């Protein structure tokens, strides 16, 4: 399998988002087709961190299907660094994986979110899991931002201790705000 990103240019960290069920939620219907709403703070939230990361969209779908999707959330290309695609993951035991060490970064640097745990079944321990987004309005993006900007902020020299150091990594930005006091 081909490395899939060139070498860095840069910030600090990279930061792997997935798309589908995390900026976007996509419904079908007879009388509409496909249809697809895009998260409260999604334009905020890649803008924003992309002062601090490298961002990485990683589309759980093939291209022909949500590239234009993703294109949308950056349509003159200031945040998203990279844009990648299910013909991007590896297929290994029957699934499809986003395999990190594919992405020529420093896995110390690394940090994927995603919401499907196949998705990072080779690298669980960078990973942020997510409950998928169902489409109704909230605030889980922006609540995301102030551990994200604290790992950028403060270095980081690895966040793989960091981001393992919680009691659930599906409640990280709930255990976070809890254990700091800002
Ligand atoms: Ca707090
Ligand atoms: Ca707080």
């Known amino acids: 399998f081909p490395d899939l990103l060139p070498p860095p240019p840069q910030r600090p960290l990279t930061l792997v988002i997935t798309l589908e069920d995390f900026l976007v ?19 905020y939230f890649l803008g924003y961190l992309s002062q601090y990361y490298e961002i990485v969209l990683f589309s759980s779908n093939y291209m022909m299907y949500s590239d234009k999707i993703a294109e949308k959330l950056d349509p003159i290309h200031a945040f998203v660094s990279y844009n990648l695609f299910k013909e991007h993951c590896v297929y290994k035991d029957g699934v499809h994986i986003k395999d990190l060490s594919k992405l020529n970064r420093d896995l110390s640097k690394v940090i994927i979110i995603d919401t499907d745990p196949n998705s990072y079944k080779l690298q669980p321990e960078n990973a942020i899991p997510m409950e998928p987004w169902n489409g109704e309005a909230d605030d889980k993006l922006v609540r995301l931002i102030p551990f994200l900007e604290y790992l950028a902020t403060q270095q980081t020299k690895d966040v793989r201790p960091i981001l393992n150091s919680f009691e ?8 976070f705000d809890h254990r700091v006091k800002k």
Do not use: F, I
Request: net charge positive.
């Open 25 to 43: 939620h996509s419904e079908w219907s007879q009388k509409h087709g496909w249809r697809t709403a895009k998260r409260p703070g999604a334009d």
């Open 168 to 175: 659930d990594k599906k409640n990280l930005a709930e255990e």
